[PDB]
Amino acid sequence: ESADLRALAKHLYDSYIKSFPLTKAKARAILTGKDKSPFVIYDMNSLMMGEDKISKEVAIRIFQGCQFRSVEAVQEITEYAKSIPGFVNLDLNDQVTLLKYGVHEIIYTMLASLMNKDGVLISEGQGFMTREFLKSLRKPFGDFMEPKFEFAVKFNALELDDSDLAIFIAVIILSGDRPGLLNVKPIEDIQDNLLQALELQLKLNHPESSQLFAKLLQKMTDLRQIVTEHVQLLQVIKKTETDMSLHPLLQ
């Protein structure tokens, strides 16, 4: 029944609110003037101003900020995954596998919520770092954030809300195509139910947006590429800057 799928949509929406302290709605209210206005970092000079509001050099301090935020996201996505009906019933190794790979794709989906064509919200929405400033960082650093902005600009064109994102990120975690997956079928049965709920949710929430379901699934291609490029750049920094490496979770 469709009434059963509506209950799954509400349950995923509630768990998303409980797990993610910074929603798209909060982020959009900050970015549009509705919630307090953020301090804008567009300069190396303006960066020093935001430090007393509220690692050696600028590009390195920003990089460790990204790594710190990545860990928090891993923690919050892990907490959310436990609530997906069927997730915790799966084999211990599979749970770990679905998270190990699925986490990178969720991070970039949810990071789009904090972005517009000209910048990104930082420090729990208190700040706003411009696209131009991030791009101007000394190489190889001033390269990593640019494709996330590229995906965000196009991903935000879908005009999704938090209730759509809750179901969409559930689909990501439950993908039966991960390396080292022992029992593929139980994962696919969960995903089938999730996709059914996502389909209904998009038809009810965006009734005028023709083929948004087909449009949303195609975006999974864009995610996989940004992950590859991120891992590729992560190796460069690991060899050039033999300093601070990945956090236990980040490893």
Residues annotated in a binding site for rosiglitazone: 67-70, 104, 230
Where do contacts with ligand HIG occur on this chain (CB under 6 A)?
61-62, 65-66, 69-70, 73, 107, 111, 114, 120-123, 129
Distance of closest approach, residue 232 Cβ to ligand HIG, in angstroms = 14
- Which CB atom, from 70 or from 116, has the smaller least distance to ligand HIG? 70
Strand order in the sheet with 115-116: 39-41, 127-130, 119-122, 115-116
Distance of closest approach, residue 123 Cβ to ligand HIG, in angstroms = 4
- Which CB atom, from 129 or from 166, has the smaller least distance to ligand HIG? 129
- Tokens representing 55 are 């690692």
- Which CB atom, from 129 or from 216, has the smaller least distance to ligand HIG? 129
- Which CB atom, from 16 or from 213, has the smaller least distance to ligand HIG? 16
Q: Which residue pairs, CB below 8 angstroms and at least 24 apart, start in 240-244? A: 240/140, 241/60, 244/64
Distance of closest approach, residue 209 Cβ to ligand HIG, in angstroms = 27
- Tokens representing 181 are 């997956």
Beta strands in 9-141 (DSSP E): 39-41, 115-116, 119-122, 127-130
CA–chain centroid gap for 39, Å, is 23
User: Would you call 119 helix, strand, or coil by DSSP?
Assistant: strand
What are the residue ranges of helices labelled H in 82-219?
92-111, 131-135, 141-144, 146-155, 162-173, 184-205, 212-218
- For ligand HIG, the nearest residue by Cβ is 65
Distance of closest approach, residue 49 Cβ to ligand HIG, in angstroms = 11
Terminal CA-CA length for the chain: 42
- Which CB atom, from 60 or from 200, has the smaller least distance to ligand HIG? 60
Distance of closest approach, residue 64 Cβ to ligand HIG, in angstroms = 8
